[PDB]
Amino acid sequence: ATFEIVNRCSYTVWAAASKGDAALDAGGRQLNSGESWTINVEPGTNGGKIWARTDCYFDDSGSGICKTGDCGGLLRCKRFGRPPTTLAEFSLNQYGKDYIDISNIKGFNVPMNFSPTTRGCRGVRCAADIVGQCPAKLKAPGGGCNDACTVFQTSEYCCTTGKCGPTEYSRFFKRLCPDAFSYVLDKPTTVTCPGSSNYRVTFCPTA
């Protein structure tokens, strides 16, 4: 599948695409305000994620640090990023269909729109001012709004036992972004798209 990854933000982002134990396509790249990066993700990829990283520094070997979404200090991500990260998530070619959602389960850094560029389904968007409105106990000093699991490390926020319900903190995310996952076991906002559909992830889609 082809993913076009566009930075509509007024600031630089370092985009990332991983499936957790490997990079997707090249894994990461600096995206300046208005730049677009087109990647190819191998069909049948299960549990892929794309995200933005903010306030970053790399050296000439591609090694450094990101204030949000750091994936072990690498420009070219192989592993998932450090919360807070708004997440575009996808499983492709799963019994003939692709699956796409947006998630706030690992917090929120940048507003995003995940939209397929080919026919047969709808996109989703989480573009409210979450970091401005963020509860004080969640607000990250590095920038962004953490998920409760990250901050409080409880069975209830982390859904450790597979039984958990909504919370003051999940409901905050849900109220501002109804079409994004707010906790591990939310009513699903997954969209089913025809297998081998293509897509565009846009950071700061309204601004």
From Swiss-Prot:
Taste-modifying protein; intensely sweet-tasting. It is 100000 times sweeter than sucrose on a molar basis. This is Thaumatin I. The keyword Signal applies. CDD domains: TLP-P (cd09217). Belongs to the thaumatin family. SUPFAM superfamilies: Osmotin, thaumatin-like protein. PROSITE patterns: THAUMATIN_1 (PS00316), THAUMATIN_2 (PS51367). Disulfide bonds join C9-C204, C56-C66, C71-C77, C121-C193, C126-C177, C134-C145, C149-C158, C159-C164. It is found in: Cytoplasmic vesicle. GO terms for cellular component: cytoplasmic vesicle. The keyword rRNA processing does not apply. SMART domains: THN. It comes from the Eukaryota. InterPro entries: Osmotin/thaumatin-like_sf, Thaumatin, Thaumatin_CS. Transmembrane segments: none annotated. Keywords: Cytoplasmic vesicle, Disulfide bond, Signal, Taste-modifying protein. PANTHER family: OS03G0233200 PROTEIN.
